[PDB]
Enzyme design. Structure first.
Site, PDB file in Angstrom:
ATOM      1  N   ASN E   3       0.817  -1.207   0.000  1.00  0.00           N
ATOM      2  CA  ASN E   3       0.000   0.000   0.000  1.00  0.00           C
ATOM      3  C   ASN E   3       0.854   1.261   0.000  1.00  0.00           C
ATOM      4  O   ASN E   3       0.406   2.303  -0.489  1.00  0.00           O
ATOM      5  CB  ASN E   3      -0.945  -0.015   1.201  1.00  0.00           C
ATOM      6  CG  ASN E   3      -1.886  -1.201   1.182  1.00  0.00           C
ATOM      7  OD1 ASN E   3      -1.919  -1.967   0.220  1.00  0.00           O
ATOM      8  ND2 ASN E   3      -2.657  -1.363   2.251  1.00  0.00           N
ATOM      9  N   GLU E  29      -6.546  14.656 -18.466  1.00  0.00           N
ATOM     10  CA  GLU E  29      -5.564  14.479 -19.526  1.00  0.00           C
ATOM     11  C   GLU E  29      -5.291  13.000 -19.802  1.00  0.00           C
ATOM     12  O   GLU E  29      -5.052  12.608 -20.956  1.00  0.00           O
ATOM     13  CB  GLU E  29      -4.292  15.231 -19.131  1.00  0.00           C
ATOM     14  CG  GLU E  29      -3.013  14.588 -19.555  1.00  0.00           C
ATOM     15  CD  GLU E  29      -2.691  14.901 -20.982  1.00  0.00           C
ATOM     16  OE1 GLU E  29      -3.341  15.799 -21.552  1.00  0.00           O
ATOM     17  OE2 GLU E  29      -1.805  14.238 -21.541  1.00  0.00           O
TER      18      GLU E  29
END
Ligand code: GTP
Ligand code: GDP
Ligand code: GDP
Ligand code: MG
EC number: 3.6.5.-
Lengths: 429, 426, 50, 426, 213, 212
Positions: E3, E29
């Site tokens: 993580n 984008e």
């Protein structure tokens, strides 16, 4: 809450119940007075001052044996009305005690039994002690079976019976009393543990080292086995069995109810403390032909259901390891439709010692009740002796004079020929 | 958080779950009198799973105790933890069953279920959210086999969507404690397959060999075997009570083990089992739990899993341990001996990790295994039943209580359908 | 290091009790999950002319 | 101020009222000499509901003890609390009623009713604002039933606006301890429907079942039942003597529970009844009380609520509680079971909360309930009465006092129309 | 520990919205630069300077050394080899002490590789994002304090092997109706599995048709 | 309650004939829009918007979701999987206050998806019809008040596997002439069932022929 009502009929019944209730007072805290200076509620009622009254009825027609116990050490133990006596004995005659003497006694004995059963919360069953060869235990007990089956029904009725010995015998007309007793015990008794006096003579000579034993030396062994049967009713254990438990674990068919009793450690104080005996010793001792207490050999017959009752310091792992040797042994044969074979019960309490007795104090024991085909040979021998007498009509006028018919012997011979055929057809592939 | 009911039937149920509640109260930090003396805050937080909070700060277990005889009630009250149970949850009969399934299911076991049902409904209406039920019993008796199966049926009728579990004591292969044991095992298994979601088969000789082989005890007591059983019973409810990196309840374990509705017979096992004198020398590492959790002799059912094929595998891990060598070992145990795993399912092993070990251990692992080698039990049971049924052995003790032969035939045919279905995957 | 001996010299023997009251003696000192242990690590931590 | 004048009648009345005064003096904190030895202040604010103010901090109760023989109130006087009673309130008679409604109503009770009415007027003029009366007696007796019915019929006329309650001991369903008591009960409850606006039925076998099954008492005496009777008898007037978030006077429970002027027979119950061995195991919450208020075993009358429909249910609560867990529980009973509630009254439950619990208890609650299942008591008394009046089994003890057969005929008629009126609303 | 890297790549994706940089990159984008069609929206994520705290300072971690680490098959964070297929679109988000000229040189170095193949219809191939803020270290972590980093968001047709394996897995499991009785029994009918198999087969052969030269 | 919604479907069938609208459907109009061959005439009805009386105050259903609700497999009144057969001819009977543009938008969104499979020879496929009246509310009915209801009737290839088990059901009872003696007892040829079997096999062959 786990009570059972013991009924003693005849001289054998009273003289066995005396040893049995000595053991019951000794292994509880009960003095022969009855004062104690799921344990005791089952066999002893409670009086609020602290007294204990046994739940037993002592029945006999002559007064000698039962009126002796009213003048003994245990005179204050038993209730005065729970000892039933008569004037005339049956005189080794089934007909007298079943028709003309047992007619006017049973309305009192059933009344006392019902008065005993109304003080009980949950009744487990009855234990009936009698003898086949007598006149009281053969006749009066047999009538009592149906007389209490009528108004009690589905409750358990265990039988403890002195089967006639093959070689020795104490009477002449004992084939007659042994033959017509079984007319009613077959349709009324749930299970009938059989013990032979000759075999207990052989055990008391052989296992224990005494010659010339008295009747009390036999009743001590019988009382030890009887208390081992009902040990789980009173004492806590890991695997408790009930009075109804071996009535569904020892009889496959309702007409064949005759297992064999066997107590494994039968040893004196001179011999007990020079060897160990834990589980495999006593378990291997139970399944031997020498220690069998009915003079028939299980090697002849086929084992049908064995009920092993363990008592004392016992771990179940050693119980399984000891049953391993029995199951692997090829000289012990079971019938093909019982691949299971055994029923086990483990109890905490060790067997108690008896001052004035003959068995030593050991930490543990096992008592076995095994139903086998091998008792059919005893039936064949006894039926042979009966029709040896009956063809010449010896000792028949006394039976027909006391309210019977001549054809009642014919019914009995027919019924036990059918029972012999049943024992033959059970043991076939 | 979601709370679980415990049912006990007969001597097996009472003794096994008495040891179960003792070890749960040990693990949750509860004394014999019922008061909390533990230290960790994780011990008290999910105590609603098994216990109800009373006034004064003490906790009562959520258990119901039944038997037809009153002797074992006073026997279980006099134990070390006998005062922890609620006295109104002792529901007992006055006369016993006597190793009779018929009178434990129809005659005497029927009129008393009308109070056990009231006790269960009363406790479960105060239930905040009911996950499911647990039940420990025996198939070789008249109470656990008869009344237990009747209770399972009458609860499945009332609560349909809750998970039903059963920790049953199947009959042993060699020692039969009862001659009439196949007459109760057959008619109890025939009722189990239509009424349970999860069932664990626990044998007694398997426990003897496990205790002698691993714990090196030459003479264990019954309490030791009950401790071993309840260690697995506590090993499946860890994620309901303690935090973990990969949680799994009983429903999630049921989803990832049973592929078909009539396949819910498992054989459990415990990983860390070593003697006292060889547990300070051994480093309890992650490979060493896998190496003996999957051993063929670490099963509490008397069936050898190498003779069959593993359908699904469940591994519930407890303690502080990394997630790399869990998954690595579970892959390595599948890639090597692939002949013992069915190939029509790719993954057989379900992995769950809890972060709190049992008391006394640093890390632990509980095993639940679905195998096609469990047909070795019912084949033997059906063989004994059909050997005892063609002669009407002991049948009058059954037919006289309100039965008929067609029930016996339809039970034997159901178990034969079970053994015929199991052989299709091997 | 037993906690109940049933082959000992004592007389009253209880069969429902366990030889060992827990398996093993290797208990960790303090119980803590992985998430709270690894999220508590944020609480752990001149020239001559100026 | 709303004060209550207590009345007695017969041996049952005196024996119940003795324990009632004992427990209310315990609740208000009065030692048996009469003075106040309490610890709080709220126990002295409204003590004039049941007590007068004598000289020097001594309180005398507002009771009158009535009997037709003097041998019963001598045991009351020489009891533990027999000294607080004013000796002028003791009105006795020479010859008893002899278990005769006729003797206790027409001959012996009418020669004594003037003295008792004089004592009642002596007692009721000290009231600044009298609320109503209260009577305890039994219907199977002679002077209880007859004298109480005459007293009620005489003091209803002269005090028409007030509220009169009766904690009557209605006869036995199973085993009656008076042979003639069908006649007395039949002639008594035909009186009670026309004069009392509130009546509670007490069944001695219901109390026996409670103290055996619930309280786990082996040998209960009559004091152990009078404690239970007075627990729910003193829980009705708890809002007249202590504050609360929501109050309930006698009139508030009479308006909300008597929809028609004949159906005013309620069956009481007391919620926190625990055995001494099971008290520690049970938590004290409002769900735990409302589970037992509505239970059929808690009912103090021997009629089952599953045989009828709850017309209206009252529930008076005592202790510091939240109005959540009482309001949602009174909703939960109506929503959970609905075949036992009449559909033509949507909201069937009355709720009140007082914040001063009984002594020694954190929380308590009393039940008061109007159900049409009470008709099976009246039907049983009616059939046992007409099985005796058809061939006049004991009529000679009643006709010699001046009573005729049409009195019995019209008493039976007023039983039958009451049974029909209970049936037509079910 | 996994993580931590997931958070590092997620922070490096959203770093341009918060910290000043030479080439700001918005979140909208990525969708306009990584997917050619709505049916293909499965790119891979790669963090290049994943290195321990003790051997991060014996290595010269320049832009050229860190860019070519993203294209190595052993440094990828999806277990699929890019040599199975060919690259369709790449998005590089640099960080820290990075000059744009060395980024241009390192990206031009990748184009000369013949072991890395681009599809024909994407002659440009790359997207460049540069942020000033270096990656912040966490206490008691695993990564070291490095002066520059890059995260790769590359869309490739080599992920079609993973879909093929997943579909073979479902076909091996669904052929004899395993675990289905606890899918249909809770608000479902039988035909949803066929729909998903339908769409997944459409995805596989879309992937086979896109990489056609 | 089974029959009332069937009555609502048949009222939407005649809805275009009793009042006005935008696209009116004649009884002879769908007589050629649905049946494509002189043998294949078994269209499947579908009434998408139906809700209880309590779930109307919260949500109002628009065209783009009701049209998608017409083509979901848990709506049509024959228990056959419709994904097993390509659609051949459809008719949607819009009712109530429906603008016409969102119907073509719904048509386009139904056109682009892959679940609804059509045959190659029917590029048109769909026939639409819009009325100006909503369904009426009935006393004691279970249905709710919907402003914009749609009745859908469409041919499908998937009805081939519906009676394909009816053929096997006739086969299982014709193997030993079961129950035929109450049939041939009342003036029927015992061979007449064979000249319905060959006709049904022909019908299956024609349904398979328009499947490819
Ligand atoms: N083992 C044992 N057997 C006994 C005992 N007493 C009697 N018997 C058996 O009983 C048989 C003798 O008949 P009994 O049972 O005494 O006859 P009864 O009970 O006196 O009845 P009646 O003879 O009619 O008075 C003998 O063969 C013994 O085997 C005893 O104390 N122990
Ligand atoms: N492992 C284990 N087995 C037990 C325990 N208690 C009983 N058993 C087994 O259960 C079987 C007997 O069960 P049973 O007495 O018939 O239960 P019942 O139905 O209540 O009568 C025996 O084979 C025992 O081995 C226990 O605590 N642990
Ligand atoms: N429940 C209950 N009933 C009682 C009590 N004391 C007396 N009784 C009942 O009162 C009835 C007899 O009352 P009785 O003496 O005849 O009253 P009286 O003659 O009119 O004064 C019997 O049925 C008893 O059951 C008590 O404390 N509780
Ligand atoms: Mg004699």
């Amino acid at each position: 809450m786990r009570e059972c009502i013991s009924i003693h009929v005849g001289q054998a019944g009273v003289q066995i119940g005396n040893a049995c209730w000595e053991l019951y007072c000794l292994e509880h805290g009960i003095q022969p007075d009855g004062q104690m200076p799921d344990s005791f509620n089952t066999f002893f009622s409670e009086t609020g001052a602290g007294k204990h009254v046994p739940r037993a009825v002592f029945v006999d027609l002559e007064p000698t044996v039962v009126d002796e116990v009213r003048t003994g050490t245990y005179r204050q133990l038993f209730h005065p009305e729970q000892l039933i006596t008569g004037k005339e004995d049956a005189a080794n005659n089934y007909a007298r005690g079943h028709y003309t003497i047992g007619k006017e006694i049973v309305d009192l004995v059933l009344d006392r039994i019902r008065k005993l059963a109304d003080l009980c919360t949950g009744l487990q069953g009855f234990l009936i002690f009698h003898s086949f060869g007598g006149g009281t235990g053969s006749g009066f007990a047999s009538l009592l079976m149906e007389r209490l089956s009528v108004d009690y029904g589905k409750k358990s009725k265990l039988e403890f019976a002195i089967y006639p010995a093959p070689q020795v015998s104490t009477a002449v007309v004992e084939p007659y009393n042994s033959i017509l007793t079984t007319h009613t015990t077959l349709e009324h008794s749930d299970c009938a543990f059989m013990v032979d006096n000759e075999a207990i003579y052989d055990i008391c000579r052989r296992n224990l080292d005494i010659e010339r034993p008295t009747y009390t030396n036999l009743n001590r062994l019988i009382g030890q086995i009887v208390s081992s049967i009902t040990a789980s009713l009173r004492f806590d254990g890991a695997l408790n069995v009930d009075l109804t438990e071996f009535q569904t674990n020892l009889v496959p068919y309702p007409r064949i109810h005759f297992p064999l009793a066997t107590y494994a450690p039968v040893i004196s104080a001179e011999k007990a403390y020079h060897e160990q005996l834990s589980v495999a010793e006593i378990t291997n001792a139970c399944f031997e032909p020498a220690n069998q207490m009915v003079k028939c050999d299980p090697r002849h017959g086929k084992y049908m259901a064995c009920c092993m009752l363990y008592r004392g310091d016992v771990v179940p792992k050693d119980v399984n390891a000891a049953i391993a040797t029995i199951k692997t042994k090829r000289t012990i044969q079971f019938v093909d439709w019982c691949p299971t074979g055994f029923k086990v019960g483990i109890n905490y309490q060790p067997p108690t010692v008896v001052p004035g007795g003959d068995l030593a104090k050991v930490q543990r024991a096992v008592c076995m009740l095994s139903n086998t085909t091998a008792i059919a040979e005893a039936w064949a021998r006894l039926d042979h002796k009966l029709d040896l007498m009956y063809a010449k009509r010896a000792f028949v006028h006394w039976y027909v004079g006391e309210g019977m018919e001549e054809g009642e012997f014919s019914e009995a011979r027919e019924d036990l020929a059918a029972l012999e055929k049943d024992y033959e057809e059970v043991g076939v592939d | 958080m979601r709370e679980i009911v415990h049912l006990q039937a007969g001597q097996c149920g009472n003794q096994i779950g008495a040891k179960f509640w003792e070890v749960i109260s040990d693990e949750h930090g509860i004394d014999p009198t019922g008061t909390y003396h533990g230290d960790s805050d994780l011990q008290l937080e999910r105590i609603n799973v098994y216990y109800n909070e009373a006034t004064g700060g003490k906790y009562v277990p959520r258990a119901v105790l039944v038997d037809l005889e009153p002797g074992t009630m006073d026997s279980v009250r006099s134990g070390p933890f006998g005062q922890i149970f609620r006295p109104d949850n002792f529901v007992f009969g006055q006369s016993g069953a006597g190793n009779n399934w018929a009178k434990g299911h129809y005659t005497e076991g029927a009129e008393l279920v009308d109070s056990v049902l009231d006790v269960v409904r009363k406790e479960a209406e105060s239930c905040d959210c009911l996950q499911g039920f647990q039940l420990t019993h025996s198939l070789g008796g008249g109470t656990g086999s008869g009344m237990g199966t009747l209770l399972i049926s009458k609860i499945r009728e009332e609560y349909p969507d809750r998970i039903m579990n059963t920790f049953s004591v199947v009959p042993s292969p060699k020692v039969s404690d009862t001659v009439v044991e196949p007459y109760n095992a057959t008619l109890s298994v025939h009722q189990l397959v239509e009424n349970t979601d999860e069932t664990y088969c626990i044998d007694n000789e398997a426990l003897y060999d496990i205790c002698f082989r691993t714990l090196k005890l030459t003479t264990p007591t019954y309490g030791d075997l009950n401790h071993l059983v309840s260690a697995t019973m506590s090993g499946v409810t860890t994620c309901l009570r303690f935090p973990g990196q990969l949680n799994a309840d009983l429903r999630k374990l049921a989803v990832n083990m049973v592929p078909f509705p009539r396949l819910h017979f498992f054989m459990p096992g415990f990983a860390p089992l070593t003697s006292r004198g060889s547990q300070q020398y051994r480093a309890l590492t992650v490979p060493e739990l896998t190496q003996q959790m999957f051993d063929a002799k670490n099963m509490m059912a008397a069936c050898d899993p190498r003779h069959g094929r593993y359908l699904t595998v469940a591994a519930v891990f407890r303690g502080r341990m990394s997630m790399k060598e869990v998954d690595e070992q579970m892959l390595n145990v599948q890639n090597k001996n692939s002949s013992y795993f069915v190939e029509w399912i790719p993954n057989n092993v379900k992995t769950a990790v809890c972060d709190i070990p049992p008391r006394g251990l640093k890390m632990s692992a509980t095993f639940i295994g679905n195998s096609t080698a469990i047909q070795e039990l019912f084949k033997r049971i059906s063989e004994q039943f059909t050997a005892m049924f063609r002669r009407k052995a002991f049948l009058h003790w059954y037919t006289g209580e309100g039965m008929d032969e067609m029930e016996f035939t339809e039970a034997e045919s159901n178990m034969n359908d079970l053994v015929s279905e199991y052989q299709q995957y091997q | 290091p037993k906690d109940y001996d049933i082959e000992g010299p004592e007389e009253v023997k209880k069969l429902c009790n366990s030889t060992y009251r827990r398996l093993g003696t290797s208990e960790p000192p303090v119980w803590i999950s992985e998430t709270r242990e690894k999220m508590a690590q944020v609480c752990l931590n001149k020239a001559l002319l100026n």
